[PDB]
Write a protein that binds this ligand. Structure first.
Ligand SMILES: [Ca+2]
Ligand SMILES: [Ca+2]
Ligand SMILES: [Ca+2]
Ligand SMILES: [Ca+2]
Lengths: 220, 220
């Protein structure tokens, strides 16, 4: 497709994320975002992912810079603009994957809000994320624990300490319930592994008897 | 249901199978078979399982007895009669589970034929079983290996030694391919178990940081 030229940069940015080269991932994402936005418009489905990653990287790029104060300010305003576009694009689409992306955009909007000492807005954004996730995730999904934790943090920054304690406790509850589920999955996987190993041994000790029957049939 | 009185004996027979008490399993199966046959007729779906198990047990009961020669003869003729009824009942029904039961009835008809020094008929029955199984089983199902092996045996008893070698080799091929598949399943199960254990450890080392944040929020 003609978009490939930009999807390339989507890779080369995400690569740099796992590389830790931030301003390079920023430039990659910016170029891909500019390409897709010029082609398809400012609100197109085609730009959702692009605008999100650009936004996310910008947030990281303002975190690195911690009198260069207007630098991180401008990076955070742009992070916000891009993530909000992303959030609109995602929330429009009626599929579980898009809604969870929208929740992710909300989560990063909350993180940008936190980095701006804007804790009330942070609380609103994390709540929006949690609301979306509770419709589509299982009650022990790690993501819910991480959202509760972020929400509790934001509450604390705003001195709403009882609300903060409540969210921290919910986070702990999810983490413990997930640990239980994972323990069950371990027991199951190891049981199956034992079953298969035992059958393997049975088959192995069957083979040479058959081979001797072949030998005996040939000499007959 | 009113059949429960007989389904009881279906359990009490199968129990005795895993107990090794054969003539007791025979009497249990015979009583259940008589009950179901009186109620529903000689060819009813309701009697399939019953007539099969009776048949199978009778075969075992004639295997134990190895001038009491008419004893095992009569047990084998009855085994045959019951298993053939079972086979008709199963083959009539157009579902995978019933067809595989029909293949099982064929397999036991082949075994009765072998115990009667009737190797041509044995070959026919094992072939019927294999034909049914190759429509519904994966190419590495243990059952196919066991059928090929039984077929190869029957061939050998009838001095068709090249056919016998062919079937033995097919049996070996299935056993080796199954061993491969099981090895892959082991690798997968153990990989998953490692993943889950690692996530468990991460969650465990997350918990006390959250707990300290709760403590700090309360004292605030
Ligand atoms: Ca603005
Ligand atoms: Ca030998
Ligand atoms: Ca007869
Ligand atoms: Ca402390």
């Amino acid at each position: 497709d003609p978009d490939s030229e930009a999807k390339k940069l989507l890779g080369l940015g995400q690569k740099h994320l796992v590389m830790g080269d931030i301003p390079a991932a920023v430039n990659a994402f910016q170029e891909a975002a500019s390409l897709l936005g010029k082609k398809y418009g400012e609100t197109a489905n085609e730009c959702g992912e692009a605008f999100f990653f650009y936004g996310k990287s910008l947030l990281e790029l303002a975190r690195m810079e911690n009198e260069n104060e207007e630098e991180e300010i401008g990076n955070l305003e742009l992070a916000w603009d891009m993530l909000d576009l992303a959030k609109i694009i995602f929330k429009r689409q009626e599929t579980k994957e898009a809604q969870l992306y929208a929740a992710q955009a909300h989560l990063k909007l909350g993180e940008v809000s936190v980095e701006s000492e804007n804790y009330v807005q942070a609380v609103e954004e994390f709540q929006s994320c949690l609301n979306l996730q509770e419709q589509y995730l299982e009650a022990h999904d790690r993501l819910l624990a991480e959202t509760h934790y972020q929400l509790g943090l934001a509450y604390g920054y705003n001195s709403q300490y009882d609300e903060a304690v409540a969210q921290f406790s919910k986070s702990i509850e999810v983490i413990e319930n997930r640990m239980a589920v994972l323990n069950e999955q371990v027991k199951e996987a190891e049981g199956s592994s034992a079953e298969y190993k035992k059958e393997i041994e049975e088959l192995k000790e069957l083979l040479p008897e058959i081979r001797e029957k072949i030998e005996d049939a040939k000499e007959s």
